[PDB]
Write a structure and sequence with these properties.
homodimer; 175 residues; Rossmann fold; five-stranded mixed β-sheet; two-stranded antiparallel ribbon; binds the ligand Nc1ncnc2c1ncn2[C@@H]1O[C@@H]2COP(=O)(O)O[C@@H]3[C@H](F)[C@@H](COP(=O)(O)O[C@H]2[C@H]1F)C[C@H]3n1cnc2c(=O)[nH]cnc21; Stimulator of interferon genes protein (chains A, B); antiviral protein; sting; antiviral
Chain lengths: 175, 175
């Protein structure tokens, strides 16, 4: 349904174009930019997928143990008539007991914001109960696309709320 | 169907966020940046909608009478966890008889590229004959959204090929 189009839009528009050349940007930050004494940013992009489609624009305000650190070197590309459309990513540190536990490239999945707004607009004909299924369908289709296509550059983090920093840390430790 | 989700994604993700503050950027270029002797960039964003979903990334190569001139001051905003996600636009001149006939902010509609790629991917389950209807449906839904919501900042340019520069000029002269 709606999520299926959004999922393919996510892969074709964003993931297919920045994942193949994301590792080099992380290398460039770690070697040439990252502080000489602060470890290394992980090699994988971690994507948050709140199934309730609550996607705040500020990750740091969504968890005090998460806070912005730096940005990777931005990726530019001529896209659909725009000269040097800029694809940017933000590096975040994760705090356990007040000490930096992990640093990675972390962001939410924007199409989930699109689903949430459509449920809020009268003309979209989208319901709140419809949204929760589309949120799940969006992740499934995204998983199917990434299964058979770059690889090992993207880890999906889905969660439903009855610590987000502990949730993300939990994924970093597994690899 | 698929286009309906893409159309609302286009409005919620891009148009709702740059159209309200596009006029000021055009003012800033025209006054502080644009060459003292080259006229004024038009106040409206013109969006190309090729119904065949052929969207080249280089506008200039799609018509020799169209060629890149400059970029507007980029718009930045914290979006879905990304700090200072950059929304950029490119200014183009239109050539009639080899003399500059018009200058405006021109770009293609990216979701049409997404539709085209889905028709090319086996897992998307999207057909070429399906695409042509979805391309038309995408424009209709986009027209419906813009009808009852900013306003007079965006002109849609749809066309089917049996001069793109003459086609765009035709729209500038009407206002
Ligand atoms: N700056 C801009 N210039 C020109 N057009 C733009 C811009 N911004 C948005 N649009 C248009 O608006 C819709 C909705 O996009 P939204 O933001 O909802 O998310 C999009 C979609 F899910 C899909 C892109 O597919 P596309 O067909 O391009 O659709 C877009 C496009 F038509 C992936 C995702 N995505 C794209 N880029 C980034 C990024 O840098 N970070 C994080 N996610 C990103």
């Amino acid at each position: 349904n709606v999520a299926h189009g959004l999922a393919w839009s996510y892969y074709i528009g964003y993931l297919r174009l920045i994942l193949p050349e994301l590792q080099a940007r992380i290398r460039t930050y770690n070697q040439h930019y990252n502080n000489l004494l602060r470890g290394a940013v992980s090699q994988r992009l971690y994507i948050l997928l709140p199934l309730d489609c609550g996607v705040p624009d500020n990750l740091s305000m969504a968890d005090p143990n998460i806070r912005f650190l730096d940005k990777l070197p931005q990726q530019t590309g001529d896209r659909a008539g725009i000269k040097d459309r800029v694809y940017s990513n933000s590096i975040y540190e994760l705090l356990e007991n007040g000490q930096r536990a992990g640093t990675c490239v972390l962001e939410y999945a924007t199409p989930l914001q699109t689903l949430f707004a459509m449920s809020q607009y009268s003309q979209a004909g989208f319901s709140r109960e419809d949204r929760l299924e589309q949120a799940k369908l969006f992740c499934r289709t995204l998983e199917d696309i990434l299964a058979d296509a770059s690889q090992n550059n993207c880890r999906l983090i889905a969660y439903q709320e009855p610590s987000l920093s502990q949730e993300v840390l939990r994924h970093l430790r597994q690899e």
